[PDB]
Design a binder for this molecule. Sequence first.
Ligand SMILES: CCCCCCCC/C=C/CCCCCCCC(=O)O[C@@H](COC(=O)CCCCCCCCCCCCCCC)COP(=O)([O-])OCC[N+](C)(C)C
Ligand SMILES: CCCCCCCC/C=C/CCCCCCCC(=O)O[C@@H](COC(=O)CCCCCCCCCCCCCCC)COP(=O)([O-])OCC[N+](C)(C)C
Ligand SMILES: CCCCCCCC/C=C/CCCCCCCC(=O)O[C@@H](COC(=O)CCCCCCCCCCCCCCC)COP(=O)([O-])OCC[N+](C)(C)C
Ligand SMILES: CCCCCCCC/C=C/CCCCCCCC(=O)O[C@@H](COC(=O)CCCCCCCCCCCCCCC)COP(=O)([O-])OCC[N+](C)(C)C
Ligand SMILES: CCCCCCCC/C=C/CCCCCCCC(=O)O[C@@H](COC(=O)CCCCCCCCCCCCCCC)COP(=O)([O-])OCC[N+](C)(C)C
Ligand SMILES: CCCCCCCC/C=C\CCCCCCCC(=O)O[C@@H](COC(=O)CCCCCCCCCCCCCCC)COP(=O)([O-])OCC[N+](C)(C)C
Ligand SMILES: CCCCCCCC/C=C\CCCCCCCC(=O)O[C@@H](COC(=O)CCCCCCCCCCCCCCC)COP(=O)([O-])OCC[N+](C)(C)C
Ligand SMILES: C=C(C)[C@]12C[C@@H](C)[C@@]34O[C@](Cc5ccccc5)(O[C@@H]1[C@@H]3C=C(COC(=O)Cc1ccc(O)c(OC)c1)C[C@]1(O)C(=O)C(C)=C[C@@H]41)O2
Ligand code: NA
Lengths: 479, 123
Amino acid sequence: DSVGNTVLHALVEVADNTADNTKFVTSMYNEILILGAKLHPTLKLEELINKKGLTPLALAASSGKIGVLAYILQREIQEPECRHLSRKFTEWAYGPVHSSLYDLSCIDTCEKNSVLEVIAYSSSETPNRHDMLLVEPLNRLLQDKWDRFVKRIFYFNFFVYCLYMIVFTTAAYYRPVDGLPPYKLKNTVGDYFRVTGEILSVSGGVYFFLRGIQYFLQRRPSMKTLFVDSYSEMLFFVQSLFMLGSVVLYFSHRKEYVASMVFSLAMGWTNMLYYTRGFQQMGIYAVMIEKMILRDLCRFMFVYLVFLFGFSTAVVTLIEDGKNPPDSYNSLYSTCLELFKFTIGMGDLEFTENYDFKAVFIILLLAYVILTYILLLNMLIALMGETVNKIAQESKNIWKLQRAITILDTEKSFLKCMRKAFRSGKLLQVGYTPDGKDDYRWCFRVDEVNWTTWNTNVGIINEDPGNCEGVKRTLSFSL
Amino acid sequence: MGIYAVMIEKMILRDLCRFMFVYLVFLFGFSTAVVTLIEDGKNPPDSYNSLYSTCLELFKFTIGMGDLEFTENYDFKAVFIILLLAYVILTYILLLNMLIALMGETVNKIAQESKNIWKLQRA
Ligand SMILES: CCCCCCCC/C=C/CCCCCCCC(=O)O[C@@H](COC(=O)CCCCCCCCCCCCCCC)COP(=O)([O-])OCC[N+](C)(C)C
Ligand SMILES: CCCCCCCC/C=C/CCCCCCCC(=O)O[C@@H](COC(=O)CCCCCCCCCCCCCCC)COP(=O)([O-])OCC[N+](C)(C)C
Ligand SMILES: CCCCCCCC/C=C/CCCCCCCC(=O)O[C@@H](COC(=O)CCCCCCCCCCCCCCC)COP(=O)([O-])OCC[N+](C)(C)C
Ligand SMILES: CCCCCCCC/C=C/CCCCCCCC(=O)O[C@@H](COC(=O)CCCCCCCCCCCCCCC)COP(=O)([O-])OCC[N+](C)(C)C
Ligand SMILES: CCCCCCCC/C=C/CCCCCCCC(=O)O[C@@H](COC(=O)CCCCCCCCCCCCCCC)COP(=O)([O-])OCC[N+](C)(C)C
Ligand SMILES: CCCCCCCC/C=C\CCCCCCCC(=O)O[C@@H](COC(=O)CCCCCCCCCCCCCCC)COP(=O)([O-])OCC[N+](C)(C)C
Ligand SMILES: CCCCCCCC/C=C\CCCCCCCC(=O)O[C@@H](COC(=O)CCCCCCCCCCCCCCC)COP(=O)([O-])OCC[N+](C)(C)C
Ligand SMILES: C=C(C)[C@]12C[C@@H](C)[C@@]34O[C@](Cc5ccccc5)(O[C@@H]1[C@@H]3C=C(COC(=O)Cc1ccc(O)c(OC)c1)C[C@]1(O)C(=O)C(C)=C[C@@H]41)O2
Ligand code: NA
């Protein structure tokens, strides 16, 4: 059509994930490929693209379609003359044990739109991105890319970053207090280590600034409501604005460089919770922070700032001048601070006596403590009790995705890893295509068992079991 | 009585060893920021320039004995209060109310398991 969709595209567009719709979509999706080969065996139906350039496999991954995705990856057409359209190939079976070759042609970072890329980089307006990492050839592919060449690099990124915050702490702790900020450099062994510690701290601050600025502009354009999806990357960019903010103030002869550097230190150590994802039980703790600093704390700090600025306007209107730790509490800033201390647990009734009408002054403080210390802070605990029960299940789904983006970004950063990114490549011969040729398609492997049924298998690639680097193919193959 | 002491050995290795890593990031995060601010004597009296004292003065906000304006030897009062108010909201309001919710989930899990562990610890 005008959009570029063909028949196999439109069956994906008209899916809506319900188990009745998954039945007759994949049934009708099956019948067209076979009938495509009977009329046109020279045609390859699923290579075709629309004007966005997506294949019907990747279109099911770009949207949230899970049943159409689980079908195409686990696709075997058992009947002969149209078996080359399969994707899941069982290789041998020895009673219970059932070994299968999944296929990795369009997926696994080989092409322009691989479904491992398109799932992870999707803008979260498409649902069920977390669900689409549960299918079988993907969920054992990311787990088996982590166990070699990515666990070694991710532990090295976390070690260099911890050597960055020890240098940037110590170079800021021992800063000169003497005078105006472009400081001369004495010939000591102390000042050589310090000005080295500053140059290694600015150059780290440029690195987080450039990887920020390619994430927003050169790749991945992002709208304003998407900054709760890209939360973990926004914090590494705000840090690099303060650290480069100090270098402007440092050479502008301004003493306010210690007001921007310090917010980079406090945000520097705090962003070390970015690396505690990729660990399972640690990672569910830091997911709940980014889900409850935008949901439960931003709602609570609106209601709390109504009550605090409600009653601390009432109290300053009461208390008069000196009238006769001493301080004039007539400022609105002091009395908004003295009523914050009731929440913190350091709460001083009778903090002043410069008022008049003692009866209404105590009633205001006692109506404040019951509203704020007794009621809201015991409602916040109950509402976090409901939120943690909800995102107990969701956070396992978000953690697997936050493991997957690490694996993709490491592959894009190295060309020699891309020739090592062929996880279980093996370039295996699988079957026989039309025009009488070998298959030669990159294939993965898996193992299962079955005991409820008797495990009857119609087609088996290798008649003789096991994988000992020597096989003989079965005569079950037609050609 | 025995179901009470099983929950201690299951939550001094699971819930407290995870919490005391995140808490020691925030406490050593902000108490590095504060010592970099506060300058020398410049003119309960004490020199708060040590990292040990200021890591202790920010522990006291968790314990419920929390003194804002614990020093005045700094400069830039506006950034000193913002650091303390971003600390108290992060630590006293957010994490300690997340710890109560996460112990609420753990006790519901090991309510059933602890009857099973008690019979073994009797055996
Ligand atoms: C007194 C105390 C003693 C301590 C002495 C300290 C002196 C040494 C200090 C050194 C730190 C100074 C460098 C600053 C740059 C920042 C580095 C960084 O953290 O970024 C990355 C490093 O991963 C990389 O790819 C960059 C590698 C850095 C160059 C290596 C040279 C130093 C090696 C050192 C070891 C030599 C071993 C030799 C070989 C075995 C990791 O971060 P990221 O996760 O990629 O960024 C977030 C990504 N995100 C934005 C998408 C979320
Ligand atoms: C593994 C975990 C632990 C690791 C431990 C790591 C090392 C541990 C320790 C390390 C150093 C121990 C200190 C010895 C020297 C003390 C100096 C002194 O007494 O004079 C004075 C400094 O006045 C100066 O300007 C002199 C500068 C010399 C200090 C050396 C800088 C540190 C190295 C650069 C970084 C390395 C870069 C590496 C590059 C490759 C004393 O300073 P102050 O009175 O405290 O001023 C505070 C100012 N404030 C309160 C206003 C904020
Ligand atoms: C110069 C100073 C540099 C220091 C930093 C250099 C560090 C370099 C790297 C260090 C990495 C440490 C080695 C990890 C190797 C095994 C991984 C693993 O078992 O995965 C499991 C962890 O699952 C969890 O949730 C347990 C958490 C343990 C990891 C420790 C957290 C970070 C502490 C670090 C402190 C940083 C200090 C902060 C900054 C000073 C996940 O598998 P599972 O499904 O859960 O299976 C359960 C099996 N189990 C029973 C074993 C749990
Ligand atoms: C002088 C005047 C001061 C006040 C004017 C400033 C207000 C100007 C405008 C502000 C607009 C919001 C800015 C706050 C950032 C929060 C992020 C966000 O909104 O995205 C969240 C959208 O989900 C929601 O918005 C609903 C849940 C939070 C309610 C937001 C109310 C905050 C307004 C008062 C804030 C004051 C706090 C501090 C006060 C200083 C996404 O996070 P989530 O967890 O995925 O959402 C739940 C799931 N859900 C999408 C299915 C629903
Ligand atoms: C300067 C650098 C400082 C940091 C470097 C030190 C880190 C070096 C390495 C440390 C490795 C661990 C040592 C802590 C002892 C805990 C016991 C344990 O791990 O066994 C537990 C394994 O289960 C788990 O590990 C997952 C749940 C806890 C996560 C552990 C993170 C602690 C790392 C930060 C600790 C810092 C705390 C204090 C900070 C001073 C068994 O208990 P469980 O309840 O049966 O497990 C849950 C059930 N499960 C098995 C099914 C999952
Ligand atoms: C959890 C965090 C809390 C912790 C503490 C936070 C504390 C921060 C809270 C507040 C900031 C404190 C500073 C304010 C200034 C008061 C000081 C003073 O002396 O008064 C002065 C100003 O006079 C007034 O300010 C009158 C008050 C008008 C209130 C208008 C409401 C604003 C709506 C807001 C919506 C919020 C609603 C909430 C909904 C989200 C009078 O003196 P002056 O003579 O005019 O001086 C001028 C000198 N000159 C003439 C030479 C130029
Ligand atoms: C809940 C429990 C908390 C309760 C309180 C706990 C408090 C404990 C917290 C901390 C211990 C307190 C003691 C430290 C020493 C500071 C004192 C001082 O005066 O500075 C001195 C050292 O200078 C420095 O120490 C600079 C700071 C280096 C920071 C390096 C980061 C370490 C990473 C850690 C990873 C952790 C991250 C967390 C992740 C798990 C400067 O003075 P000097 O001149 O050098 O003196 C030498 C004299 N001489 C020259 C003759 C020999
Ligand atoms: C960019 C945002 C939205 C943000 C920037 C700063 C100012 C922040 O305050 C907030 C607002 C705020 C202020 C006070 C209390 C709660 C929230 O939340 C984060 C932001 C949030 C936190 C708390 O969250 C974290 O940093 C932990 C964290 C968890 C997961 C992550 O992936 C992560 O990034 C790696 C960081 C700590 C601060 O960054 C911090 O160090 C300081 C001084 C203030 C915190 O604004
Ligand atoms: Na108290």
